[PDB]
Structure formats: structure tokens, C-alpha cells
Design a protein around this nucleic acid. Structure first.
Ligand SMILES: *O=P([O])([O])O[C][C]1O[C](N2[C]=NC3=C2N=[C]N=C3[N])[C]([O])[C]1[O]
Lengths: 640, 255, 301, 246, 252
DNA sequence: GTTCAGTCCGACGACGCATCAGCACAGAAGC
DNA sequence: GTCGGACTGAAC
DNA sequence: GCTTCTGTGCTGATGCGTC
């Protein structure tokens, strides 16, 4: 009986407190009960505890059901290098609910908008559509099989096939599994816990109850007799072993099977890094200015780098001559740049066999011999690998070395890495170059190189240490390199002052209030408001509550004719424009969807804000006094 | 080892086409008695059962009981590639991985052949009991087909209510509501064109128009069909394919 | 133009505001104020480039433009506190077969006089002064460029006046009080006040005398009188003194000088004079109300 | 209270198949005279008049005139069900938001009824005056329809020429030009010669009504809206009015 | 300049409708002997030879030899508006800028005419030598089209086989292979006759056969000719007037 | 011993290639 | 991309 | 000629991958 299944009970026993017999496929109902117990809890370490409890139960009763229940909590459908994705829209889910509950679409949309959650409305309702056979209860293996089938089934009339399968899963719910299936299909599982925390709950479970025990499990608490603190010290050093083992090779399909059949301490003996498998790339931390860099790197001798506005690429060259290219978010993007694969005979020196390197790829002008913006790259085609007719050329900027000729280098100082990078490759002007780096601690050259970068078409500054914390290993700290943004380095940036025109209802944590906004500039040569962006970030909880409480009475049932919108999301409410909110922008860009500033530079393409952020409610103004589209164009010109 | 020749291949065309829309993969069991096809839909809402008997075949010879897993799409298209009047001969031997179809023309000069790839298939078998039914109606195939083809536009589900005076359909939705009260064809027994009702107790229920639109595809096999309705029971729709067989459908209600 | 009155209408009576699209105005003669039109055309041949291309665009969809130029401007509060480029436009009107009128004063008054006397169905301007001059129909935003989408906004003076119940003089006073170019108004009472105060006090003179606090800043020199008589009977020409006729456009005469005084794409201009000329094979289709009278409206219960 | 019965239900199918397309939403005026309906199209370049006198109704009662606004795409979808020879009967209450319909098959077996939702719709109405047309052509609708289709295949401007000696239809497109003629063997009556031009971008929408009547009449005068008229049995007729292309 | 009249306008209606999906423009060459049109397709893989001999029409008058570039889609949009039973007439001048098409109805209540814009085109002319094809077959056209409609449904390539008393079409793909069997007949209302020399087997694109198949109402009997790796000749005999000959490349 | 200090997690945003749905009509097939 | 948000640790 | 539909794109609408 899983209907009272309680993992919140103190001292869980891996076999005695479960609700299925061993050898059986794990009942998805228990996974749903456990997700409902996790969301009821706020404390993060208590959530990792409850997930570790359940991972321990699975490896005690049904070890083969491990791999799916990870993805039932991790929401992912496979290694990102394969390219598998669910490919279902939230509209499709809302129509499937309407079919399986028999309720008409307008009412369900209105309920889902007032609650902000498809999983809540999946319950409290029935279609009375009684089948002749009450359905078989779903397994976690079965749930995963049906989700990968939704990912696989495509082609003409595919939304019928998807609707059918989703109907079938939905009518097979018993008590409360439906809410979590509704979440599961959106890519928005809202579990309150993610990759690092599932890896932690896993590490705790596999340390408490190792694989290779026969049933009934001979050992359940490998920490027995130790004090909880020294237990925690053993747990966390083992957890660091797991995290590093996960970092050197991203995919659980190489980790979890060998974890069962060899055990957790001997993992690194088999799991060596090699060209042809991608690896987790470094992240960056937002810092405002050079005193902060100097306190962060006081003992650390560091060097300076341009932040180029390109795409991150890892190159993985095998000795047999096949070479692959991978993005930040792990996907195989090779065949976007087959001409680079044609360039490989000339790039490496004749004395080397294979390598792994990291590079920023930027489109390059052949006769102009200059950089071009990210808006150039984003329009690059993706599916066809046709190198005969090439439209947009590319040049490479190096910024780190991983692997050379059969030696791993991730563990090493950036000094020896960059030395071996330079001493073991040839530069090719217009094809591939080192990023220029200046090797000093004086603030003047740093703010000089800042100016040189912002005038050499780059975003900001990158800072890296040569040896102190310099190594590639994410698990110690993910953010070993620093991003120095122009955004607050100027003290105040491209501030703009925009009128409210419309609001979006809140969802998730934001539900029961507003959750997004639409804003306008003023067009005085028409006396009308041009929609310029959607605002959704940078307002705090209680100032959001103040924005809602000010807007509640300000609605209008109709669109007032003073609005201009097109293609952009039709708002949930129309608002009379009575206040202005100062906001911040990171870049102006030529929106193919927004009307504002159309024809002041390009005829049809309007203008909108890269990376918009709210700042302050400008309570004293009148609406027409706000920013004009002519100023907006002036700023755009000033960007070049 | 199987061989089965039948003169009117048109029935075989009609039944494959009429089944395609509801299921893509199904199994025949072939035995020396004849052929059966039981199958379930992916929603597991609508169950279908076809039965053929050897005396309906002209030249029937099965020695070993063989299951054929077949994708409806490829074989439906193969019979779209055939004439109505053509004499059709299925052939295979023990553990044959390929299904042979012979098509015979009335000109003697044309004798076409098509090979279909078989495939592995496992299907769930369910045992629906024969029983009394509270209401039974015989209707011309056209009249029920038209009623449903119409009412598909007025709503999504139909509230049926059979009685001794006449069977009622009724529905409601986006544009209004719509009722059809077929009476019983009582004073003149035309047989070929009659509506007939027999009822021990009235039954009233609700059903899905998508699947009724999927069911009605077998209307060209017979000028009439029979409906069995009973309280809380899956609707039985039956198509008596002359003296070669029966095709039956169960519909899970919307109670 | 009068400040904020479009806002008053768009909040109180959107029903007389009709958003419509360019091809709905086939056959229509339109009385264009040349002054505001050439002013936006300047925003050195760009004033001519809009004067050419916008005129072409109007001609394509059955619209016959009537360019009206300004005469003596009245005693503006700002202006009473050059025609090289103006006559440059008069040059190509004859050279492209479009008529030129010269008003005795602000051409918006003479465009409104033309509309209110049946010679023309719509005007072309952005300022509501023509509605206040008594024009039953105002058509706005036509003169915008091809990329600036701007569907064309009708206003219906008859419907506005009917819905509030407040007569033409009780609409002139609204405009003056709501903030004309002729004088300042009372900056101490809100724009929303105008409909309600006119409903309670259907003149500026009755409106000021009832409430005399220090918080009500009536104009220091109270020109809320003189503008009322101006908008009642402005200095305008006789409409029937000029029977409008649209002539054959020149195929070469403009282009022989056009690329010559201001070097510009030959192909655009030559295609422009072709397309405008071919649109004259259209301008043909008419409407039933011209043949048969409206008996009225029939209302369902 | 509204109650009308009509054995010729199959014409209502044919009527609603033509009215729906040029006018998505329209209002009937129901009177002691019978049922009528008038409305203008989008550009106000054409209008329709439906006339049906109470004489042809198998039973009629009406205590007062009634104005009913209805979406014609809804009535077309409804009548895409009702049978090709059914008796059609219409009913309405004194203030209802619904219209009742009752359909009886000839064989009495399939008996149907419906109750649609009304919507509030007030539309402008134009009172056509009586007049004589300098040309009247009376001729089979089936050739007229084919000619209009054949000409708008090439170009949208049609010229219709009417005189004692014959009828002519002229048009041209980017590919070249064409002319069609009809000879008195079609019947023509004239007082003065007339020649006019119109848009086939409405005449090929007009010629939908081919199933409603076996023949059409064309009424024309100089600078006057072309009238295209179809008879409805004895019970009434349908007219279209189209403004000229000056 | 010339003038030509034929009572059976449907003949030229079908003559056009057969070509409309092969080539959008072509040079019609008209001379005192008759009308010829030789052209390749939009892809060079095939050729057409359409010939109508002057004595085949009811009235012919050509005094100056002339070839016009013609938009075939345009003339399709012309003739779609006329009944099949009407008398056709065509007139051309020496200054080849407009052609006159005239429709004379059997009910003389309607006679009509259209003037079409001509174009200048230069078709790449070629020489087609007559040759003894190692296999040739004559058969009724309706089933030959059905066979093509069937085989192209399962795949995009077809293989012919031509033996001394047996011809077969074959096509293979994901869902299997389909074999169509032809045995010679030797009298009936229709017959299939084989003129063999040596046995052969060839391959052809089912797509271009799916386009060729629109010529079926023009003839009862269609004749197909081939050798080793030469193109398939397909002739529709157009009365005693002439012929329509396709030439389709074999797939390697 | 608590006002900091850092993690980590998901709130939200803007573009754009792909890729499939939804009319819409010629077209052919079916009759 | 980016900003806020709740909570354990930081360590005085 | 009529039927419903099929095979036909063309244009519109989001999902998901950059950042
Ligand atoms: O955290 P953010 O996304 O703001 O920054 C990381 C992002 O910056 C880009 N990048 C440009 N140049 C780089 C670089 N990363 C690392 N080194 C250099 N030299 C790249 O798109 C990163 O993902």
C-alpha cells in the first residue's frame, strides 16, 4: 500500500519500510508520493536526505530501476550529446487535459491562468470516461519509456500521436501522480532540487548501501557507530569523489552502470578523459570592478582576456582524423562548421597525434578583416552541413587547453597549459588566433585594455589566475574565472524610463500576483505608446507586491487605442499607463517582432533591449515625458 | 504452410481500409478453421474483432496454426493497388518471413503479385463475455453513418437513449444542440431498409464522436448494422460481412 | 494641434474612432493640409522626396489628394509672443498633375470648409483643429511612410457630438480649454474635466465665472474668447470658387529636372510616375449610398 | 410568436449556401408579408435582397414583425446536415435568444430538430426605389456563371455590353485579352443601348446561386448599379445590387 | 503568317494538357508540311517530340515558315475556358507578337476569340535519329497509367524487364517490391503485342512517369521502345494526324 | 552569535532555424 | 542571459 | 455535372538552442 508511504518517518529501512516486493519494477505512485513530500519541505539538506532515502531504497530492492528514477527527478531524457528532447508544447498539454477531463478549453485555460499550474488543475476533476479495464499502475521504467516515446514520435499529424499517448498516461493516474506528469512534460518539473543535489542524494545513498550485496542487504548504514559530524566528513569527501568523476565525463550512461558493477571508490580507474567525449566547461562570476578583482586575486598572479561576443566551442581531435565540436550546454554542434574540419591538416604541428582545446568562435569578414555581432551568428543555419556554398565565414579565438598528445592537462596550472598551447600550435591570421592577454597587475593597463576591448567590439573583461585555483576542475568551485561587465562598471549604464502598458499573471513562486510586464516608449510625432519590451526580472518579492497592489485598480477591459503591439504576447490585462519605471538595458537590438523605432534606421525591423532589468518606480513623472524612440535610435547609432 | 484464394477481393479491400484509421499494427491468427483479428486502440478505449470462416474462402488450405503480424498501412496500400473484382490469393510456408499476395484479373492476361514484409508483433488478448443486451437496434448502415457524420459538427459526445417507440440521439455544443429520433419501421417490413428496435429495459449513456467517425468506415460492407446497448456496458456495433464473417466493435462509455 | 482631446475622446467615446485600412478609401478626394505635411516631410530634397512618394502612395488606392497651402496665420500665442521649399512643392504639383489651393489663413480651416460643404469626403492631417472647424469626418495618419504601419484613423464629429450631446460651440470651447496653440488654458483643472464641465457649463465664459478661487489659473490674458469666434468662422476661401480636377501627370517633365537638381535613383522616380499614372485607370469603383438614399437603421430588440 | 412550415426545404440549403459567403452575419425581417433580408458587403460596393412571401408557407402565423440577427456560417453548418428533400419548419418565441428548427424526412423515419443561439446584430438598411432598366437580359444562369469564371481567370475588370443585336463580355489580363458574345436564338429587351464595367471579384462570388434557379436576369442602365436577379419558385426571389466601376 | 482550323478542338486541348507539366515554355515550329515541337525538360533528363501533320486538320494555310516561343501555362489558362467539342482555329502573322485563338461552338449561339502575347525563345534544337530498339511493346494506355500510379506509390524507381513472351514492371522500397506481369495476347477489343529482338532489362524514374501519365486520353494504344542503356521512347499515336513521342533517360 | 558571504535554484527575458499544423484549392478519384 | 531568495556555514 | 476527399504547397506558430 503506497497510499500512506511515508519517507518523512525517522530511520528509514531500505527494505522494511518500502511498498513493493524486491525484483518488481518500482511503482511510480511512490515516486509521486516522495515528490509531494519533497515540495512540502523547504530545508535543502532535508530534501537531499529524502531523495537519498529513496535512491537507497531503489538500489536495495530494484537496482536496475536506478537509471530511470534519476531522470524522473533530473527531468532530462538522456545525454545531451544524443539530441533527445520531449518536443511538446504547453498548449498541447492543456488540450490533452481538456480531452481527458472532458472540460472545455476556455474554462481550463482560465483556471490554469488563475492557479498558474497545470498540475493542480490535473486533479479535482474527472471526465467520467470509464474504460472497461482499470489501467495497470505505471512503473518508473514505464513512465520513462512513454516520455522517450513522446520524444521519438514525430512527422505529419504527430500532435495526434502525442495527444493519444499523453491521454493514456493521464487516465492511468490513481491519486496524485497526474500533477507530476503534467509538470514532467513541460520541462518545468519544479522539484526544488537539481543536478548537483540529485548527485548528492545519490552519493549519500550509494555510500550508505553499496552495490554488489545480495538480498536481503547485509549492510545498510556504512556510517554506523561514527558520530554524525565525522559521518558527514566521510559523506562529503566521498561526494567530492563522485562530483569529480561526473565532471570528467558528463553522461550517466558511462557512470551509473560501471558504478553498480565496480563500486564507488574505484570509479576513476576506468573513467579516463579522452578526445571524442565532451567535458563540463568553466563558468564565470559577475564582478563590478577592479578592486574586487584585486581582493579576489590578491595572492593570485592573473592575466587579462577579451570577452568576445561569439559561441563557446570545445574541439576534440582523435588520432584517426575524425574531430568533433561541442557547445557550452553539452550538445554536439559539429557540422555547423565543416570547413573547420577541412582546416585541421594546417592548424596542428606535425609532431602531435590528438588534442582537446576550448575556443570562442566568431563570424569573420574576409575582405573587411573585422569582427561582427552575435546577431550575425544567431541567423547562421543549423541542420544542413553543406560546405560548397558557404555564406558566413568563421575565425577562432583560443582561451584554454585541455589535452595534448595523450596527456590530460585539466589538473594543471594555466601557466603550463597556455605555454603548451603556444609552443605546440601555429597561428593563421583570419582563421585561428590566440585571444590577446596582457600579463600585469597595474590598474591603468587593466582599465586601458577595458577601453581597448569595448572599442574592439567585445562585451567586457575576462580574468584568469595562472596557478592559484587556476585548474579546470569544477567540483571545488565552478566559478574560477571572473566576468567584468560594462553594465555597472560605468556606475549607471543605459538607463531608460518606460511606461507600464500591460501585465502578465504570476506562476510558480510568483503565482497569485503579476509575474511579467509589457512596457512602451513614447512616440510624440503620433502622441502614442510603442511597445518596446517585456519586463520580468530584477524586482524583489515585496516591491513586486507593491507593483501588483498599485496596478490592481488600473486595468482597462479593452485595449486603449494609444497602444502599439504586434506579434509580441497579447497581455492578460490592459493597463491605463499612469506610472513610469526606470529600467536598465545591456544592449539595443533590431527586433523582428517589436514595433518601436521602426524606420529610423531599418524600415520594418523595430528595436528592443538585450537583457532588460527593472530598477525604480519613477513616481513623479507624467507618461508622455518618458523616453522617445528618437533617443532610442541615437543610442543604437552610438553602439557602432 | 498457408494458401487462401477468394474471388471477391473487394471485401478484403473494404475491410482493410475500414480498419486502417483506428489501428496501424495488428495480428491475424490463421488456422484451418479460418482467420481472426482481435485488436485494441492506443487509448485502450475501442476494441475491434474480425472473424472469417473457411467456407467463405473458395480455395482455403491451412495446415499449421500461424500468427501473422502485419502493419495495416502497407497492406491497405497494396489492396488500394488492386481491382475490386480481382481474385486474391494469400500464400506462405512454414516460418515464412514474407507474405505473398496474388491478384487475378478477369482478362487472364494480367496476374499481379505483391510481397509484404512481415514483422514481430505481440498483442493483448481480452475475453469479453457474450451476454444479453438491454436494447438491440438494427439500422441501415447509411442512416447511422449520416446521423454520426452530421452530429460530429454539433458537439463532441452524444447522449443516446433507446426506447420502445424510437431510438434518440441528442447532443449539444458550440453552435447549439441537435436531436434525431429514429422511429421503428413498423407497418412495412422492407428488410433491406428498415430500422428495428427490441428492448427489455431502456438504456441511456454518452459516447465519443471521434471513435464513431472511426467506426463508421465499415458502412460499405453491409446495407445495415446492429447496435447493442446495455447499462454501464461498452457499446457493441456489429457488421455481418455476408456469410464470410462478422466485424464487431466495443466502445468504452463516457458515463 | 489641441492638446489631449484625442485622449478625452479615446477614453469617453472610442465608438466614433474607427480604425480602418488604406484600400477602404478608394475614389475619395482628400483635403490635405500642406503645412503640417511638408513640416513632417522635412523630418536637402527630403521634403520633396516625401512630397513625391507619399502622393504616389495615396493615388494607388483610389485616393485623390487636394493640397491646401497656408495664407496669413492668425495671432498665435507662441508665434505672436522662407517659402523657397514651400513653392518648391507648388512646382511639382503642376508638374505631376495634382491641384494646389492657397487658403487665406491656416489651411486646416480651408480643408474643413471644403469637407463641411460636400466637395471632399475626408481631410489629411494629424491635428483635430479640422474637427473643431466643423468637419464631420477626419482621416488621420495617411501621410506616414510605407514601413510605419499606421492603419488610418477616422474620427466622426457627428457621432462624438451626438454621444455627449454637446454642440459644435460646446466642442470649440473644449478645444480651447484643453489647450490650443492660440493661448494657454487653466493648467490647474485636469483634462478629464472638459467633457463634464461642458455638460454642466456649455461655454468657456460660463465655465470660468462659476468658480473663482486662487487655485483655478484661468489665462492671464484670457484669449478663451477670441479663438471661439475664429473656429466658428475662420478666414477661408470659397470652396466652389475652385472646382477640383485631377489632370494627366507628366511622364518625363519632372524626371528631366528631378535627378538633375537632386541626384537620386532614376528607376524609383520613373517607376513612381508610371505607377501613379496606371492608378488613374482605377479610381473608378463607387458606392450604393450615392445611388440610393439611406432609409435609416433597423434595430433588433 | 413565429411558426412557418415549408415542404421545399431544399431551396433554403441553396439560399444559405449563397448568402453566407458575401455576408457572414445578417438579419432577417419577419413580417405578415413573409420573410425578407437585406445587407451590404464589406466595401459597401454590393448588397443582397432576399424576398419570400407568406403565400408559399404550408402554415404561417405571426402576431407582429420580428427582427432576427443570425450568423449565416452557423446556419450553413446546421443545414449541411438537413436532408436533400426534408420538410423544413422554423419556430421562435416572443423574446427568445434561440431559433427552433424542425425537419421531417419524406419517408417519416428520420425526424430531426435543432435550437440555435441568436446574437444581437443591428445593421444599416438601404431602401431600393422602383425603376426601369434601359437593358433587361433574360438568360440561363449556367452559361452566365461559366463566362464570369472564364473571364476572371484572365483579368478582374469585366465590360458588359447590351444591345438589340446581342450581349458581349470583354476582359483582359497580363497575358492578353478576350471577348465573349451571346446571340438571340438568351433574350434581350432594350430602350437605350447600355455598356458598363464591373468587377468579377464580385461576379464570381455572385454566380454561386446557380442551383437556386434555372435562369437569371440582368437589369442595367447608364450609371446605375447592375441588378442580377434569380426567381424563387412562386414564393419569391433574390436580388443582388452592384455599384458600377466608373 | 498562317491560319489553321480543326473541328475537333478537344484534340489540341489534350495535345496541350499532355505537355503543361513537362515544359512551361517551348518553340512551336509551324510550316506548310505541319507543326513540330522538339524540346528537353526543365532538367535535361528527358526530351519531347510532338508532331501534327498539316493534312490531319480540316483547314490549313501556311505561306511563310515560322517558329514562335510559347508560354504553355498561358495557353493552358486559355483553353481551360472552352468546351472540348468546339471547333478550334489558330491564326498567326509574320510579325509574331500575338496569336489569335478562336472557339466555334456546335451550338452556334456562341463563337469567341482570344489574343495571346507571344515571346521570343530559342529552344536548343537537337537531332533524334530513328533506331531499331532491341525491345518494343504496344499496349492499351489506361492500365499503363494505373501501373505507374501503383508502382510510384511504393517507390521512386522502376525496373522494366522485356523477355520474348513476357514483360514485367518492378519497383522496390521500404514496404517491399511490386511486380506487374504482362503476357502477350494473339483478337480482342484491345491486345498487347511484343516486337522482340533481344531480351532486355532497364531502370527509370517513377516521378517522371507520374508526369508522363497525363497523356492517356490522347490515344487508346501506347508504344514503348528501348535498348541496352538508351532512353525509353513512349509514343501516343494521335489519330492519322501524327504522334506525341517522349524520350526518358534510363537510371544507372 | 548575527549581520555577512557564498551556493544554488528557478523566476524571467530576447532572438531564430527548424519544423510541423491549418487552411485553402486544383486535382484526381469515386461514381 | 540575469537578478533575487531562502538557507546553512563563516567566523568572530 | 456533383461528391468528399486527397495531395498540394504557403504562410503562421511555437519549441528549443544560443547567449
Ligand atoms: O557567464 P556569462 O555567460 O556572462 O559569460 C560566459 C560566456 O562568456 C563568453 N566568453 C567570451 N570570451 C570568453 C568567454 N568565456 C571564457 N573565456 C573567454 N575568453 C562565452 O560565451 C561564455 O559562455
Amino acid at each position: 500500500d503506497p497510499s500512506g508511504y511515508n519517507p518523512a518517518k525517522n530511520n528509514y529501512h531500505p527494505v522494511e519500510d518500502a511498498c513493493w516486493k524486491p525484483g518488481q519494477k518500482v511503482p511510480y505512485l511512490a515516486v509521486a508520493r516522495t515528490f509531494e513530500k519533497i515540495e512540502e519541505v523547504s530545508a535543502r539538506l532535508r530534501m537531499v536526505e529524502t531523495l537519498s532515502n529513496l535512491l537507497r531504497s531503489v538500489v536495495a530492492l530494484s537496482p536496475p530501476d536506478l537509471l530511470p528514477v534519476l531522470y524522473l527527478s533530473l527531468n532530462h531524457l538522456g545525454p545531451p550529446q544524443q539530441g533527445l528532447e520531449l518536443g511538446v508544447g504547453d498548449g498541447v498539454l492543456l488540450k490533452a487535459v481538456a480531452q481527458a477531463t472532458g472540460r472545455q478549453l476556455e474554462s481550463v485555460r482560465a483556471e490554469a491562468a488563475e492557479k498558474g499550474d497545470v498540475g493542480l488543475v490535473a486533479e479535482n476533476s474527472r471526465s467520467t470516461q470509464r474504460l472497461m479495464l482499470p489501467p495497470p499502475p505505471l512503473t518508473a521504467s514505464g513512465v520513462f519509456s512513454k516520455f522517450r516515446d513522446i520524444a521519438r514520435l514525430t512527422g505529419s499529424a504527430s500532435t495526434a500521436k502525442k495527444i493519444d499517448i499523453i491521454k493514456g498516461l493521464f487516465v492511468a493516474c490513481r491519486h496524485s501522480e497526474a500533477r507530476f506528469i503534467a509538470r514532467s512534460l513541460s520541462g518545468r518539473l519544479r522539484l526544488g532540487l537539481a543536478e548537483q543535489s540529485v548527485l548528492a542524494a545519490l552519493s549519500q545513498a550509494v555510500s550508505l548501501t553499496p552495490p554488489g550485496q545480495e538480498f536481503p542487504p547485509a549492510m545498510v548504514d556504512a556510517g554506523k557507530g561514527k558520530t554524525a559530524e565525522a559521518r558527514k566528513t566521510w559523506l562529503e569527501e566521498q561526494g567530492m569523489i563522485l562530483k569529480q568523476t561526473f565532471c570528467e565525463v558528463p553522461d550517466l550512461d558511462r557512470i551509473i552502470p560501471v558504478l553498480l558493477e565496480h563500486g564507488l571508490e574505484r570509479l576513476p580507474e576506468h573513467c579516463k578523459l579522452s578526445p571524442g567525449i565532451p567535458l563540463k566547461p568553466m563558468l564565470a562570476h559577475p564582478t563590478r570592478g577592479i578592486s574586487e578583482v584585486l581582493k579576489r586575486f590578491e595572492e593570485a598572479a592573473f592575466t587579462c582576456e577579451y570577452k568576445y561576443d561569439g559561441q563557446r566551442a570545445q574541439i576534440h581531435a582523435l588520432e584517426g582524423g575524425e574531430v568533433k565540436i561541442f557547445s557550452r550546454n553539452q550538445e554536439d554542434n559539429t557540422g555547423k562548421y565543416p570547413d573547420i574540419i577541412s582546416r585541421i591538416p594546417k592548424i596542428k604541428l606535425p609532431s602531435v597525434t590528438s588534442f582537446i582545446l576550448d575556443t570562442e568562435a566568431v563570424a569573420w569578414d574576409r575582405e573587411k578583416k573585422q569582427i561582427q555581432p552575435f546577431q550575425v551568428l544567431t541567423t547562421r543555419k543549423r541542420k544542413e552541413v553543406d560546405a560548397s556554398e558557404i555564406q558566413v565565414q568563421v575565425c577562432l579565438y583560443a582561451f584554454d587547453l585541455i589535452y595534448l598528445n595523450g596527456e590530460s592537462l585539466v589538473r594543471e596550472p594555466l601557466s603550463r597549459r597556455r605555454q603548451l598551447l603556444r609552443e605546440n600550435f601555429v597561428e593563421t591570421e583570419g582563421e585561428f588566433v590566440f585571444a590577446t592577454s596582457l600579463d600585469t597587475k597595474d590598474i591603468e593597463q587593466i582599465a586601458e585594455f577595458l577601453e581597448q576591448s569595448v572599442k574592439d567590439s567585445c562585451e567586457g573583461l575576462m580574468v584568469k589566475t595562472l596557478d592559484v585555483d587556476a585548474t579546470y576542475e569544477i567540483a571545488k568551485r565552478s566559478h574560477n574565472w571572473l566576468k567584468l561587465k560594462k553594465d555597472y562598471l560605468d556606475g549607471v549604464g543605459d538607463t531608460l524610463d518606460l511606461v507600464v502598458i500591460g501585465a502578465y499573471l504570476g506562476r510558480g513562486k510568483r503565482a497569485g500576483r503579476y509575474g511579467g510586464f509589457l512596457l512602451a516608449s513614447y512616440d510624440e510625432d503620433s502622441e502614442e505608446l510603442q511597445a518596446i519590451c517585456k519586463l520580468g526580472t530584477g524586482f524583489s518579492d515585496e516591491e513586486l507586491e507593491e507593483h501588483h497592489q498599485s496596478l490592481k485598480a488600473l486595468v482597462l477591459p479593452s485595449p486603449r487605442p494609444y497602444v502599439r503591439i504586434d506579434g509580441a504576447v497579447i497581455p492578460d490585462h490592459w493597463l491605463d499607463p499612469s506610472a513610469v519605471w526606470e529600467v536598465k538595458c545591456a544592449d539595443l537590438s533590431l527586433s523582428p517582432i517589436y514595433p518601436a523605432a521602426r524606420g529610423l534606421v531599418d524600415s520594418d525591423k523595430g528595436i528592443s533591449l538585450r537583457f532588460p532589468r527593472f530598477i525604480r518606480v519613477r513616481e513623479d513623472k507624467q507618461p508622455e515625458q518618458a523616453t522617445t524612440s528618437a533617443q532610442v535610435a541615437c543610442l543604437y547609432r552610438k553602439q557602432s | 504452410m498457408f494458401e487462401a484464394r477468394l474471388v471477391q477481393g473487394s471485401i478484403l479491400k473494404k475491410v482493410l481500409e475500414a480498419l486502417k484509421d483506428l489501428i496501424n499494427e495488428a495480428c491475424w491468427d490463421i488456422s484451418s478453421s479460418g482467420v481472426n483479428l482481435q485488436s485494441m486502440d492506443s487509448s485502450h478505449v475501442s476494441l475491434v474483432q474480425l472473424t472469417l470462416r473457411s467456407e467463405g474462402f473458395d480455395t482455403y488450405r491451412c495446415d499449421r496454426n500461424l500468427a501473422m503480424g502485419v502493419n495495416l498501412t502497407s497492406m491497405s496500400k497494396i489492396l488500394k493497388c488492386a481491382g475490386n473484382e480481382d481474385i486474391i490469393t494469400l500464400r506462405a510456408e512454414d516460418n515464412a518471413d514474407t507474405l505473398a499476395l496474388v491478384f487475378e484479373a478477369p482478362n487472364q492476361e494480367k496476374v499481379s503479385d505483391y510481397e509484404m514484409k512481415l514483422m514481430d508483433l505481440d498483442v493483448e488478448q481480452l475475453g469479453i463475455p457474450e451476454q444479453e443486451y438491454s436494447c438491440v437496434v438494427k439500422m441501415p448502415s447509411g442512416e447511422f453513418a449520416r446521423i454520426c457524420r452530421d452530429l460530429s459538427h454539433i458537439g463532441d459526445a452524444v447522449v443516446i437513449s433507446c426506447a420502445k417507440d424510437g431510438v434518440k440521439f441528442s447532443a449539444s455544443g458550440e453552435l447549439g444542440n441537435g436531436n434525431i429520433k429514429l422511429s421503428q419501421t413498423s407497418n412495412v417490413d422492407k428488410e433491406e431498409e428498415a430500422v428495428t428496435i427490441e428492448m427489455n429495459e431502456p438504456v441511456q449513456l454518452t459516447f465519443a464522436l471521434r471513435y464513431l467517425n472511426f467506426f463508421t468506415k465499415a458502412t460499405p460492407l453491409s446495407s445495415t448494422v446492429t447496435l447493442s446497448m446495455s447499462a454501464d456496458v461498452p457499446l457493441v456495433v456489429e457488421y455481418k460481412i455476408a456469410d464470410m464473417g462478422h466485424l464487431k466493435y466495443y466502445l468504452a462509455p463516457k458515463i | 494641434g489641441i492638446q489631449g482631446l484625442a485622449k478625452l475622446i479615446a477614453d469617453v467615446a472610442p465608438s466614433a474612432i474607427r480604425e480602418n485600412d488604406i484600400k477602404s478609401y478608394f475614389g475619395r478626394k482628400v483635403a490635405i493640409d500642406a503645412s503640417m505635411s511638408i513640416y513632417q516631410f522635412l523630418i536637402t530634397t527630403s521634403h520633396l522626396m516625401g512630397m513625391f512618394y507619399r502622393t504616389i502612395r495615396m493615388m494607388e488606392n483610389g485616393i485623390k489628394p487636394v493640397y491646401v497651402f497656408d495664407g496669413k496665420p492668425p495671432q498665435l500665442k507662441s508665434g505672436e509672443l522662407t517659402k523657397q521649399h514651400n513653392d518648391e512643392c507648388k512646382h511639382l504639383l503642376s508638374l505631376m498633375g495634382i491641384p494646389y489651393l492657397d487658403a487665406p489663413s491656416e489651411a486646416e480651416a480651408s480643408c474643413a470648409a471644403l469637407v463641411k460643404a460636400g466637395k471632399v469626403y475626408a481631410a489629411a492631417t494629424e491635428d483635430m483643429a479640422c474637427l473643431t472647424f466643423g468637419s464631420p469626418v477626419l482621416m488621420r495618419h495617411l501621410t506616414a511612410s510605407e514601413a510605419k504601419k499606421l492603419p488610418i484613423q477616422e474620427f466622426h464629429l457627428s457621432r462624438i457630438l451626438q454621444e455627449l450631446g454637446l454642440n459644435q460651440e460646446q466642442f470649440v470651447d473644449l478645444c480651447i480649454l484643453l489647450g490650443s496653440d492660440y493661448c494657454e488654458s487653466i493648467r490647474g483643472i485636469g483634462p478629464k474635466r472638459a467633457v463634464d464641465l461642458i455638460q454642466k457649463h456649455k461655454s468657456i465664459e460660463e465655465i470660468v465665472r462659476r468658480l473663482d478661487p486662487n487655485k483655478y489659473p484661468v489665462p492671464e490674458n484670457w484669449l478663451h474668447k477670441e479663438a471661439h469666434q475664429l473656429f466658428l468662422e475662420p478666414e477661408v476661401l470659397d470652396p466652389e470658387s475652385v472646382e477640383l480636377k485631377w489632370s494627366e501627370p507628366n511622364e518625363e517633365e519632372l524626371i528631366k529636372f528631378m535627378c538633375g537638381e537632386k541626384q537620386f535613383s532614376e528607376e524609383r522616380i520613373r517607376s513612381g510616375v508610371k505607377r501613379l499614372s496606371k492608378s488613374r485607370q482605377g479610381s473608378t469603383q463607387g458606392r450604393l449610398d450615392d445611388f440610393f438614399k439611406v432609409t435609416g437603421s433597423l434595430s433588433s430588440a
